[PDB]
Symmetry: C3
């Protein structure tokens, strides 16, 4: 008999929770940032070298974006919209293994589908950073870290 009121309060409370999330996302997207599945992304307007871009991303409480899933890869290459963007792709260690600067473990197995066919070709033996280039799932290219490009920052949505 009273179970009705309890349930109303409940829907209202869940409604409240969703309004809170949308609001938080809106305040951020309102400031020229993008948003996708738990993360905020910034697509720069000015080109930088890989490291200056990273340094910039850090100054905005984020990192050059990592890619952790196929849906994220697809969001990135689609939002990139034909323009080329530095991402968190960079060689580290004494092995020249690829890595994410934000320290996401690099998924070798899954990443295979994310490279432009033929890349990374390490041209000139001087291509130790990665960018998003092609308008396809197979989007990544290795390029010299000192070349300037637009870049993409990423930081997690946190209540």
């Amino acid at each position: 008999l009273n179970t009705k009121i309890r349930a109303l309060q409940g829907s209202l409370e869940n409604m409240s929770k969703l309004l809170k999330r949308q609001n938080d996302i809106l305040q951020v997207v309102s400031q020229g940032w993008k948003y996708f599945k738990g993360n905020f992304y910034y697509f720069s307007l000015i080109p930088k070298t890989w490291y200056s871009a990273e340094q910039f991303c850090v100054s905005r409480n984020s990192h050059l974006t990592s890619v952790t899933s196929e849906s994220e890869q697809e969001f990135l290459y689609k939002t990139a919209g034909g323009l080329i963007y530095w991402i968190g792709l960079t060689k580290a260690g004494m092995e020249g293994d690829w890595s994410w600067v934000d320290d996401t473990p690099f998924n070798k197995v899954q990443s295979a589908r994310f490279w432009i066919p033929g890349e990374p070709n390490n041209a000139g033996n001087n291509e130790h950073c990665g960018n998003i280039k092609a308008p396809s799932l197979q989007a990544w290219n290795d390029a010299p870290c000192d070349k300037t490009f637009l870049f993409i920052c990423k930081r997690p949505y946190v209540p």
Copy 2:
């Protein structure tokens, strides 16, 4: 009594629907798209020829935008903000038509052209773009010119 309870019930499910709808819009706008009156719009950062622009829209499950109302025309010219954008205008005969198969209204469209256009300059201007910062915004240009472009796709919850 129950009378006023199902009232709260109703208004509550109505907001839920309203909130869901705002989320749908937020999600797409969060991916760099625009929204206006039941349609999503994409104003590109990259310029392309008309043909390549359309392929680009198709690959995003949309089409170069049509224009169905002065209201839409105003949203488009304002948002273009002084830049030139390919839209879904193309010849087919040679009558003008919308690439998304929206029926082209000669009469309504008469008002949307820049004064003096379509001038078919060089006799090779078979595509349309938004150029002037006003309701009279469209110019016809050669399909091979490379301009920014605008995609359109319906909002569906």
Copy 3:
């Protein structure tokens, strides 16, 4: 107790009514902001901003703003300065800074009072420098709180419009 059960139940129903109506109000605010943001504008703390895509002279930039029911943006706080320079993304944008000719004081085109004290820390070090006795306008230039440069008003830059969010209630 049957009397207390009635009281409680009622106060709770009145409460739900209060909240449901408040929520409706908050969805409307969400919708106001969303509609404008969905249209290429930005939003920050009670104000909408337009970061232009096309460059203009200072006077022509202001003119455009007026046509979109706004003005070249003023800077009223550190928080707004930071929002502006960070959102500028490294690009140069005209703002509402304007000097009354030679030896004139600096003012805001939207009539916001100019805080000579505060403003000191918003200029790039060394500005305003009036290079050429020509620079009667201000722009956001450097990616820092010390961001402002004075430049000749006939230079063409991208520009930033600003207008208050006034709820449609």
